[PDB]
Amino acid sequence: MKKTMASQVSIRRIKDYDANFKIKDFPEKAKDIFIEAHLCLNNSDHDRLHTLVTEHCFPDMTWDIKYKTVRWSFVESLEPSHVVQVRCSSMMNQGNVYGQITVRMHTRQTLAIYDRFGRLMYGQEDVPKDVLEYVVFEKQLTNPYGSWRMHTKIVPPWAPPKQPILKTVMIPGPQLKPEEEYEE
Amino acid sequence: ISHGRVFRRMGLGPESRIHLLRNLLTGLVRHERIEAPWARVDEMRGYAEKLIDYGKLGDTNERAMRMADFWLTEKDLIPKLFQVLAPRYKDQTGGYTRMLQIPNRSLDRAKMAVIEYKGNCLPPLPLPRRDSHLTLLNQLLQGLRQDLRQSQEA
Amino acid sequence: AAPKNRRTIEVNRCRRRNPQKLIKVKNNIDVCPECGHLKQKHVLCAYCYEKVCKETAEIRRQIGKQEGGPFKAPTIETVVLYTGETPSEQDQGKRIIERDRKRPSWFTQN
Amino acid sequence: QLSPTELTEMRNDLFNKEKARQLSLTPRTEKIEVKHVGKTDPGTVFVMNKNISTPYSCAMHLSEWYCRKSILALVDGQPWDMYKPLTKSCEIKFLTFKDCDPGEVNKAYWRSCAMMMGCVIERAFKDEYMVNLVRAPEVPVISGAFCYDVVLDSKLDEWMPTKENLRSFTKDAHALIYKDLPFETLEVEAKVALEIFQHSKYKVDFIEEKASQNPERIVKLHRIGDFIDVSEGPLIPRTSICFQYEVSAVHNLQPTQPSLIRRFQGVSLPVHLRAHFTIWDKLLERSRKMVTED
Amino acid sequence: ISRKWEKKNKIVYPPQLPGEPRRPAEIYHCRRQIKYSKDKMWYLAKLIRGMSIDQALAQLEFNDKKGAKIIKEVLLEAQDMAVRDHNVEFRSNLYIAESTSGRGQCLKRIRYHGRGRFGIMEKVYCHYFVKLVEGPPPPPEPPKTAVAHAKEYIQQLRSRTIVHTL
Ligand SMILES: [Mg+2]
Ligand SMILES: [Zn+2]
């Protein structure tokens, strides 16, 4: 944060729009916001979820679990959250000013995803395992009623592969028209 | 009562029946492979078979020339019959054509068939093949044939 | 003649749902050894017959283009040749058809 | 000694214990990319589970035509049992009875019928008598019949089965076919198989020679119902594959003074290669003749 | 109108404890406003009723009736979303549970007759419903054997009492 001047330049701009702002306490509330967002998916309280996460993040948390039961819980936090980088939007781009804050998660979580008929599909509800993900928050600085919300998650190219699914999947090959011979 | 009646009642009458068969035969001569309703293919097959027999008689034979003139609406096919088809089957005494069943056409679900002259330049049809000699049933029968063969010679 | 009384649904069910009125199950269905599509025992496979016709149509289109006019049927044999092919020793004095394609595997060359 | 009814119980328990152990050492869920290589529906890729999925499971993914017709699976060019779990990601090919060269399918069918017919030998005879099988000779298909080597008690030195006795053997086999037992395979260490068949000297010799020719010193055991046998090579998936079954006759090998060897013989034909009654009758006459390996 | 069949795919059951067995997957699919007679389509629906998905497709492919191809596509797309969206592992592990046809909305047209008369013809439309259940098709009910007749007759004889008395 010291060697990246753009981070503090972004921070002072956020302080310009809101004087009562601190960086040493944001990770604690951000983790609370992150946890509150995820436990919401258990009961699918989309009304309150609108106040906790961004409109861009909403489709990613709802579309794939529309007719599924999610049993998500938080057990432990391995490492305290750190403010990786803070950046702001361009000035007067479309009449609004946005601010992005990037924070790093290294905690322990639990997943239990069931299908339409209640049969287990993904995750296992008992054993927790370490989760390493990067979390970016956004807030509408210009809007007086704006607030920081879950916006986007970053997947590093070196991230470990996700846990394999329970069932087997067959991938069809290239379907061939009668005149089209098979080509590797 | 239709006992021994070997000719189907097709078309508008005996004249139309001959004309319909003649048109199918002419297309079979020109294109060497045509598809038509199954019943019409079977009826036309006999006329197609006998055409080569008249073609083998030679173009100088006046009876064959008159028969070829009537049965070939397009006059350009007469030299082809007397100089291409007849020389090709000179060593063959029968079975110049093979007839197969194809899936029914979507227009009226009619029984469809394909008839073509053997030795054509077109790509081969997916002819049905009997079982290979390497299968379990064939191998067992082959073993019976050998053991029976060794029993009689001894 | 006109019906005397209205036929009840019980009678109609006994007639419409008669066993011979039902569609009989076909037991002459098998998979094609080459393409894997369903076919009848006594009927040529739809997939393989149709792919032969398209090749035949393409060759026949080449036949007419080289022909260039009706009532000009050649008095010689015909042999179709694909890309990277040369006339054979027995292929002499016969009309040659050039196809801008590779010879199919099922199209065995004589 | 141990009664036959308890010998099957402990052998089944050992087989189940080994099967549980093989599953236990296997991790929970691993994905193997199995690619479908064949003339029908090429390029299909199956992402299955190691040591859990089977070539039959891949067959159900495509269609029931593969499940009904594919008698053998070809993994990397070597034959593979239909219900044998896969151990690695590899190309897969399926074989049917009506193929260009169904040599492996016929050989797999030939050995499969030997075990079925061999299984009913123990249950056929009286409890007081003792029956101890020797081995399953790899008799060629063209011989006309499959054979199994059995040794009977010292009471039945001059006893030869009649027509009714051979009829009873067929009836038991048809009931075995009717019950529709799938063929279960298990690749196991030689020492594990030795303690399973410690009560049979001939099976012990068969296990030790199979381990000798195998560099890994492991043998494959196949199970049908409650019966376990040491067989070499893949088998057909289930007992319902064979349609026409019959045991031809019984022949005595020579010499008999050191040991009495009875060569039971029979012939079979699957559902896919059903034959006419007259044709089957001639095959029965041919199969009754004694056959010996080269 | 009523469209309850479409909503039948939106019901979600609570997660199952390991004690209870596996709940078989079920999929509700239907095609509306087909230019076909419901009576004629009933025969095809009854034909493929109770059979496997792939066996039903084979039977429908070689059927000459026009409705056969309509059901064939309906079965094909029903199998697609079953594996893709309904957690179905094997696409061939499906059997037809119920298949039926219902009357759709139809128009009324005039058919001219001689002597200035007329008749009201009707352009018939119909719907087709189908439900697919994961798993092998259940075995058909075996014919009731003679011994089954024997015990049933005995039971009737043993179940008779002295009537119109104490
Ligand atoms: Mg008028
Ligand atoms: Zn085909």
XYZ file of C-alpha atoms in Angstrom, chain B residues 11-118:
108
model
C -51.789 -45.937 -63.939
C -54.822 -44.997 -66.001
C -54.840 -48.210 -68.046
C -52.752 -50.649 -70.087
C -51.456 -47.802 -72.261
C -50.611 -45.629 -69.254
C -49.025 -48.586 -67.451
C -46.628 -49.179 -70.351
C -45.844 -45.461 -70.597
C -45.112 -45.190 -66.868
C -42.827 -48.231 -67.015
C -41.160 -46.842 -70.144
C -40.357 -43.531 -68.437
C -38.874 -45.343 -65.433
C -36.825 -47.573 -67.744
C -35.506 -44.578 -69.695
C -34.378 -42.865 -66.497
C -32.795 -46.116 -65.336
C -30.891 -46.321 -68.628
C -29.749 -42.690 -68.558
C -28.908 -42.295 -64.861
C -28.097 -45.981 -64.090
C -29.749 -45.620 -60.648
C -33.250 -44.356 -59.836
C -35.637 -44.424 -56.885
C -39.364 -45.004 -57.317
C -42.324 -46.609 -55.517
C -41.570 -50.194 -54.547
C -44.351 -51.785 -56.598
C -43.428 -49.797 -59.712
C -39.757 -50.727 -59.290
C -40.603 -54.433 -59.071
C -42.793 -54.315 -62.187
C -40.194 -52.350 -64.164
C -37.425 -54.748 -63.093
C -38.499 -57.427 -65.566
C -38.477 -54.992 -68.482
C -35.042 -53.717 -67.447
C -33.729 -57.290 -67.285
C -34.927 -58.112 -70.807
C -33.516 -54.911 -72.335
C -29.929 -56.177 -72.128
C -30.984 -59.460 -73.743
C -32.272 -57.444 -76.694
C -29.135 -55.305 -76.478
C -26.942 -58.406 -76.686
C -28.617 -59.290 -79.999
C -26.628 -56.501 -81.659
C -27.632 -53.181 -83.177
C -27.616 -54.706 -86.671
C -30.526 -56.945 -85.640
C -33.637 -55.135 -86.845
C -35.922 -56.592 -84.160
C -33.766 -55.232 -81.332
C -33.474 -51.813 -82.985
C -37.259 -51.479 -83.246
C -37.668 -52.619 -79.635
C -34.991 -50.180 -78.455
C -36.575 -47.356 -80.467
C -39.918 -47.770 -78.692
C -38.575 -48.409 -75.187
C -36.063 -45.513 -75.193
C -37.821 -42.153 -75.481
C -34.472 -40.338 -75.711
C -32.730 -41.513 -78.875
C -29.224 -40.777 -77.562
C -29.500 -43.731 -75.160
C -29.789 -46.295 -77.976
C -26.054 -46.066 -78.839
C -25.312 -46.309 -75.108
C -27.397 -49.474 -74.721
C -25.814 -51.184 -77.732
C -22.224 -50.096 -76.986
C -21.937 -49.687 -73.190
C -24.506 -51.784 -71.329
C -24.441 -54.805 -73.649
C -20.605 -55.105 -73.740
C -20.487 -54.800 -69.943
C -22.811 -57.779 -69.371
C -21.588 -59.981 -72.240
C -20.132 -62.486 -69.759
C -23.140 -62.293 -67.411
C -26.236 -64.363 -68.187
C -28.638 -62.857 -65.642
C -29.189 -60.648 -62.639
C -28.060 -57.421 -64.311
C -29.936 -55.331 -61.716
C -30.224 -55.391 -57.932
C -33.249 -54.002 -56.094
C -33.306 -52.824 -52.482
C -35.791 -51.267 -50.070
C -35.231 -47.708 -48.840
C -37.052 -45.805 -46.079
C -40.491 -44.510 -46.997
C -40.656 -41.027 -48.484
C -41.966 -38.292 -46.207
C -44.537 -37.004 -48.718
C -47.013 -39.892 -48.463
C -45.199 -42.665 -46.511
C -45.103 -44.770 -49.681
C -43.062 -47.954 -49.938
C -39.864 -46.809 -51.657
C -37.239 -48.820 -53.525
C -34.022 -48.239 -55.463
C -33.015 -50.113 -58.626
C -29.654 -49.725 -60.351
C -27.626 -51.506 -63.017
C -24.674 -53.528 -61.752
